[PDB]
Amino acid sequence: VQPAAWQVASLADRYEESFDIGAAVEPHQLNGRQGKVLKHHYNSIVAENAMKPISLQPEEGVFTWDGADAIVEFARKNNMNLRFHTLVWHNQVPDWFFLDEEGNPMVEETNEAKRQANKELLLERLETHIKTVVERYKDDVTAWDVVNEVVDDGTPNERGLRESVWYQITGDEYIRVAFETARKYAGEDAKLFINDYNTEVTPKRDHLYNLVQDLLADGVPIDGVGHQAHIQIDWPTIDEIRTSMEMFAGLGLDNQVTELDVSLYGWPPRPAFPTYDAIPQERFQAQADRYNQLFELYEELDADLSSVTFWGIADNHTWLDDRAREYNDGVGKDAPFVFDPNYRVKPAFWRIID
Template identity: 50%
Template sequence: MSRLAKIVSGIMAGAVLILIVAILIVNRSDPNEPAQSDIPSLAVEYADFFPIGAAIEPSQTNGLKAGLLKKHVNWLVAENVMKPDSIHPAEETFNWSNADKIVAFAKENGMEIRYHTLVWHSQVGAWFFKDSEGKPMVDETDPVRQKANKKLLLERLDTHVRTIVDRYKNDIKSWDVVNEVIEPADPDGMRASEWYKIAGIDYIATAFQAAREAGGPDIKLYINDYGTDDPRKRDLLYDLVKKLLDQGVPIDGVGHQTHIDVYGPTVESIIESMRKFAELGLDNIVTELDMSIYSWNDRSDYGTVIPEEILAQQAKRYGELFQAFRDHREILSGVVFWGIADDHTWLNGFPVKRTNAPLLFDKQYQAKPAFWSVVDPSVKTD
């Protein structure tokens, strides 16, 4: 072969290689494509019942997790970045970037957003509860100064709520205004937080009123709590909400966190709580759904291989739960999972560090038996 022929042959071989690489690049999977693209969409399957949501972090707006979210949910809530200490860490400082990222992702993908949470006893800046001299308000014993501290705290709260609601009122219609204010073991059944010790229930009323005034009549305002299936806690929350409603406080609904496990509580107790609040003319939302594979007082660990019978038990229970949700959709306006897949869940570290699997997708983003029992009621999980 002549030197020229060798050169031409080499050029042609190189061109073929380039063409092959180009074809592979064009035809490769979208990095944001969900791991299983050929399965039903949760959001689509429940379009005739209620929206399906998930809690996310800003880092999950790219990659495979983003693909999973875009396929299966039409409602988002920030897991942490809209909580008080993240968005308002100091009196004169608001951090909007992470919250804005989740809002932008939702809007780009045609999803609605819930706000969680304007007021909480946890993940809140200590500055809220310092007096004008920088001393802890809860330590004050002088009645005159206590009154001044309460006024200062409620003014700070009013500014906090109005500033956030004003920024997002056109993008977010569903708001957790106050979170976890009931604690049966504390005096009067109210959580003995710094909010309550300094301002009584006036802080709850102030937060709702400020949110309504800043956001207008079209946003929906919720009081959110866990364990609402427990009759004692449910009734304490009911009495509080009724009292506030009688005072003209603008509460639109109750958020039921619904952190449950494969053993309890009963599905009926969850629905009964919703019925009770519906009697007040209030909406109900399941705001933080997950299902631990361990009972509440169990500290054991299955390790990396979860028994098939436990996953089947979880599937059966998820199926029963969503059947009840569908049957009572007239008193339930949405269901939000506290995550989307088992690789990212607070239950991997609470109450002890271990393997948990509380969601519908596993750590590899594959649909679990629980997914199929939710999307297809005819699936048998016995």
Template identity: 40%
Template structure:
């Protein structure tokens, strides 16, 4: 009888030990799974695209706090000032510069080992009236405007030399009128096409190491694409120090098509230029620049149908981007999340838009997962 009890006790002990071992093994697996899940959650866009191109975001002075800051640090390794380096903001008067906000962004980039793009040195908007006005109130002379442009570029570019790796030197110089070539801005009226050439030359002199870009919107639309290509080819043929083209990427769930996007990428890169998507967002409305009021049948609800269309468009865009990783040297989203987008105010004031990969609560949207969950063997 004692032997029976001994055997029973031995079996019981073995069962307990085995159960404990099994429990420890399962616990280790659960911990490992949890750790892997946490690690996956900590990855950001910059990590998924580390073998492709830097992923950036446009920022404002209030971006470096709370959830916005957390999102920036997790997902991006490049920043672009949305407004504070435009001439009217950073150089509001001829003898006065406003450095505070731009310096704050440059400090943030350095402290967090991030790339920084400069936006934008020469543009027909947000310039400050002083740049085109002579002392007598008339239009400034060609010689004086070139002098003022050079002073502005020298001062701004030199200040951020070594921090800003790329500049949008000239922004949106191509006309929206298909019958015209260059926009009839005051820059063009006074200087002709020379304002573009000189802007690049001055920027290169101020920082020979910086990458210099021409930046424009609607750069995928065939008729404007062809005129942008014409300008870029002219600059390349004249040995103007230009390194790349910035495709703004203010697109929508309706366009551009994959065919047009690939064609534009092929044309621009054929000139030996880098290509960057500099201002990416995907609107849920058609691009109609002149529209100022909401249509009677237009709702700003982000429906399931609109979400799916946005998912499909983002998926296509990033498939193309990955295919062009040899020529694409950067991608920047224009704003951080749907909590704020410039498209909430333009072109229709107060019409809510949802153009980004993160929602109003700074959480990833369905489009985000489509962008990061890709099979690298297919690219």
């Protein structure tokens, strides 16, 4: 019988000399016990959804600020650092960005001259998006995910870049423009990150390594790498995680762990247990060991790691459940955090609080 999260020692306090402790939040989770857990264990937050491009500009010139503002207000009120997630991504990004002046998808265009025009139009839209959003949240955001997931899992081109709508339309230019615009409007002091998953493993790691070396050499402003750390119990290895973080630190970049979850399953996450109560104790203990080693590593690397954020708060809310449902016929429960669905501490908590 584990105690409630607000009854144990604060994680932020335990790691205050090492790094921020962060959580991804939705507006509705800012009160209640989620609220209470946040104020007690965390000194940083990020918007799980309320700040992605489609959440902020769903039609051109129509900005929808309420959710994001609610999160800001809460960070402000509770003296918490705030990551911005995210200025550019190829999902939860609104359709209108990528349509030509006659409403057709720019990617379908076959004329090399109109494509060039479409590239100028898209980059202009991006610049206008970035400038507006940054200008509003400039004074509260302490770290910016300028771009998210622009590096490919494979290698479809020279630079190892995701051939998303952004790249198909503009090559690598949106990346340069994203950072340069974000620097421009946020000021020299703002911390700009390139955020991604599987940063721990090659080829992707090397591509990002190469890419940030390139961009830096050309004076494109980029302060750090965001390691999503959607990880599993036995993968990636501790040595892979360290090597990625220490490589990027070698370049003078900051590292943050930005969306950490420790799934009870592999990839794809099958077989999942159908409910939390069905999850055998065995799995909470393998997770607990994984967390112990993971936070041993983080603390060891704390010279080069400023923030560790979980992609959620307690196991009642986690996108991993969508994945579990997806790969197990609509019924499936994961449990990635150190607090359970009822805000009680899990074996993993004790392993990282000490």
